[PDB]
Ligand binder design. Structure first.
Ligand SMILES: *[C@@H]1O[C@H](CO)[C@@H](O[C@@H]2O[C@H](CO)[C@@H](O)[C@H](O)[C@H]2NC(C)=O)[C@H](O)[C@H]1NC(C)=O
Ligand SMILES: *[C@@H]1O[C@H](CO)[C@@H](O[C@@H]2O[C@H](CO)[C@@H](O)[C@H](O)[C@H]2NC(C)=O)[C@H](O)[C@H]1NC(C)=O
Ligand SMILES: CCCCCCCC/C=C/CCCCCCCC(=O)OC[C@H](O)CO
Ligand SMILES: CCCCCCCC/C=C/CCCCCCCC(=O)OC[C@H](O)CO
Ligand SMILES: CCCCCCCC/C=C\CCCCCCCC(=O)OC[C@H](O)CO
Ligand SMILES: CCCCCCCC/C=C\CCCCCCCC(=O)OC[C@H](O)CO
Ligand SMILES: CCCCCCCC/C=C\CCCCCCCC(=O)OC[C@H](O)CO
Ligand SMILES: CCCCCCCC/C=C\CCCCCCCC(=O)OC[C@H](O)CO
Ligand SMILES: CCCCCCCC/C=C\CCCCCCCC(=O)OC[C@H](O)CO
Ligand SMILES: *C/C=C(C)/C=C/C=C(C)/C=C/C1=C(C)CCCC1(C)C
Ligand SMILES: *C/C=C(C)/C=C/C=C(C)/C=C/C1=C(C)CCCC1(C)C
Ligand SMILES: *[C@@H]1O[C@H](CO)[C@@H](O)[C@H](O)[C@H]1NC(C)=O
Ligand SMILES: *[C@@H]1O[C@H](CO)[C@@H](O)[C@H](O)[C@H]1NC(C)=O
Ligand SMILES: CCCCCCCCCCCC(=O)O
Lengths: 303, 304
């Protein structure tokens, strides 16, 4: 191995010179200059300060205006809630971690960071599955109502927890990645005690490949066959934005899983891991730009 | 002396232990932990990312709408421009300096950071002077038009440069303060080669006390003597108050240091007032949006 494995960590840095310390015990300045940890903290502070108001204002405007009860309005409402969970539950630990250069909260902080970021990303993915069926049902007419949308909302939480929760209780585990200031799923070690390999295959199949198969099946029909046009256009951008956000992470995660112990450094996963955290803020932005009714209501309420 | 004087710095940290190093040569981790410097950089990064959009949008909306040509509109447009000089000309140096924990750009970086924040703050103060006279004439009619507003705009730049420029060319100097990641006027040392003592008196009298006397004179004449005019007077009251909240803590601590040179204070003493004052680049367009209905509608129109 070209890294350093400990009981609950894998540092992508060789301990041949003896300088590697646990990311739960001391600042990781042996693998990066302090000013680089400070950039990660400036970034996270931005995401929190931007992420909280824009998701709260999406939530506030939707509840205030009773005309926002289409299935799209419910789904965007649900995304704002999970985004708030990501900001307050996970990103506050990311900020404090990146400020101090290591996981000052110990493994409990690593679990919070990884869990809330995994949960929110999966709620967004399975939300895209719901919108793909609604668009397929309404446009093709093979009626999608409030009951269906509200059932879809509960479905996204169940699927997301089926992915985010097991690493909390012994199936795989959350481990620090990159510069050791964020946590994800353990793609790095075998660690048979927690049956790591079977979780990763289950995560990539059930909660990455299968949802994308559903989404692209439905769009395949719409391709191969005015207010609804506005909805369909927004859902196309949301699918594209999701892929830009998560594919770099997904690709590096899968490379590491199939090249365990190989020669990669700490920046390799740091950048796709922190870019993926923009997932907590981009969805309401698309909402404001591409939904005229929601934009008018936000302008009305805020002014 | 309870601090360490260098050729071009004064570190508020004793060198009896030998660890003090120049803020132009090495990170200043001997007087604060690295996570404390990271907070300054995170704070500076927020200000840059908020400061550029709201000032640029304030500029853009004002130019695009012919009906925003009152003296208030001209003064606010001029504040947006100066705020943008603060963000791009000075705050970018602050961000780099906080990230690395010392002035990697050396003395030139200290001059940019101090000059643009001093220039921006003083344009704001002399702008309040201009608005106080305009309100004074408007309410009492003892007329203030578009030529006067543009003349006032030019006046605020000349006065601000008469405060910020001399320290670039040998009357006083810009010097790091606090945790050594921002710069201000040298209240710390006598340094007779730059006649430090006379500049601070000139700054506090001409560029602090005289302007406040003018502002509060015109308010006092007004306090003892339609809808649109009342809206303008209300916003000017808030602008004066917001200036005092932003700058009085800094001016108070600066004047205390001037009169207690070499006394026992640490790096946090000036750091917090110095960085709080940097919010001056942001708050003025926010009052404008909240309290001017014509401007707010023109931005909603422009933005949507
Ligand atoms: C990296 O190597 C160093 C040096 O071998 C390890 O530090 C030693 O750890 C043992 C066990 O705790 C101590 O008894 C020694 O005294 C340590 N030596 C020194 C010089 O500190 C270190 O634990 C290794 N790091 C990791 C993460 O495994
Ligand atoms: C603070 O004190 C230290 C310790 O005396 C100074 O370091 C010395 O500086 C001289 C002048 O450059 C060198 O010749 C010595 O070799 C240094 N000694 C050590 C142990 O480093 C340091 O210059 C002082 N700092 C300030 C800002 O005055
Ligand atoms: C901790 C894990 C939790 C996982 C599970 C999360 C489930 C979230 C759903 C809540 C139901 C909310 C019901 C709100 C009902 C609103 C109904 C409405 O607005 O319309 C009514 C309409 O008349 C109909 O025909
Ligand atoms: C639809 C819009 C899509 C927009 C987004 C497109 C993303 C393209 C890149 C994906 C990441 C692929 C990761 C592959 C990593 C291979 C790295 C490798 O081989 O590097 C070895 C080296 O040793 C390491 O240090
Ligand atoms: C702890 C678990 C938290 C689960 C939160 C679920 C949110 C559903 C949001 C949409 C609910 C339907 C809209 C109801 C409404 O606001 O009317
Ligand atoms: C819905 C939430 C489901 C969460 C299920 C976790 C199973 C994990 C089992 C781990 C057994 C370790 C022994
Ligand atoms: C060095 C640089 C210092 C710049 C100082 C200028 C302030 C803007 C004053 C502009 C007043 C007139 C604006 C007219 C306008 O925007 O459009 C006119 C049609
Ligand atoms: C909302 C928050 C408002 C608090 C604003 C507080 C502003 C405090 C300015 C800094 C200050 O007063 O510090 C003096 C002290 O000597 C050195 O920290
Ligand atoms: C509302 C704004 C309030 C003022 C914001 C100032 C800038 C941020 C301060 C950093 C603390 C650095 C030193 C922390 C020392 C703790 C002991
Ligand atoms: C900074 C916090 C991070 C990087 C959290 C990571 C969370 C995951 C391991 C998420 C996995 C995925 C999604 C939520 C959507 C795309 C598919 C996955 C399985 C890669
Ligand atoms: C971080 C940048 C700083 C601290 C800039 C400092 C600027 C000054 C020296 C400002 C001076 C003043 C004003 C602009 C208004 C209030 C009165 C003064 C003279 C203290
Ligand atoms: C470590 O890196 C070298 C060079 O890239 C590689 O040949 C070796 O297989 C790596 N070790 C493991 C366990 O993959
Ligand atoms: C340094 O601090 C001590 C204690 O407050 C004080 O007695 C002394 O006068 C200070 N030195 C100077 C030069 O003010
Ligand atoms: C717009 C900028 C897009 C950022 C992409 C982030 C992931 C890049 C992957 C780099 C790496 O392999 O370390």
């Amino acid at each position: 191995m070209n890294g350093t494995e400990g009981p609950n960590f894998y540092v992508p840095f060789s301990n041949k010179t003896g300088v590697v310390r646990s990311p739960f015990e001391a600042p990781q300045y042996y693998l990066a200059e302090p000013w680089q940890f400070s950039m990660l903290a400036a970034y996270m502070f931005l995401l929190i300060m931007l992420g909280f108001p824009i998701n709260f204002l999406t939530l506030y405007v939707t509840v205030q205006h009773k005309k926002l009860r289409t299935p799209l309005n419910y789904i965007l409402l649900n995304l704002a809630v999970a985004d708030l969970f990501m900001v307050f539950g996970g990103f506050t630990t990311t900020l404090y971690t990146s400020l101090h250069g290591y996981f000052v909260f110990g493994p409990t902080g690593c679990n919070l960071e990884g869990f809330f970021a995994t949960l929110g990303g999966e709620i967004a993915l399975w939300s895209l599955v719901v919108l793909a069926i609604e668009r397929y049902v309404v446009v093709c007419k093979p009626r999608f109502g409030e009951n269906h949308a509200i059932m879809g909302v509960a479905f996204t939480w169940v699927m997301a927890l089926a992915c985010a929760a097991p690493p909390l209780v012994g199936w795989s585990r959350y481990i620090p990645e990159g510069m050791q200031c964020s946590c994800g799923i353990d793609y790095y070690t075998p660690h048979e005690e927690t049956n790591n390999e079977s979780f990763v295959i289950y995560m990539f199949v059930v909660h990455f490949i299968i949802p994308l198969i559903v989404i692209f099946f439905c769009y395949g029909q719409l391709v191969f066959t005015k207010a609804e046009k506005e909805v369909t256009r927004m859902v196309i951008i949301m699918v594209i934005a999701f892929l830009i956000c998560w594919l770099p992470y997904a690709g590096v995660a899968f490379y590491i899983f199939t090249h365990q112990g190989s020669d990669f450094g700490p920046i390799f996963m740091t950048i796709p891991a922190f870019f993926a955290k923009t997932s907590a803020v981009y969805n309401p932005v698309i909402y404001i730009m591409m939904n005229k009714q929601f934009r008018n209501c936000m302008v009305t309420t805020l002014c």
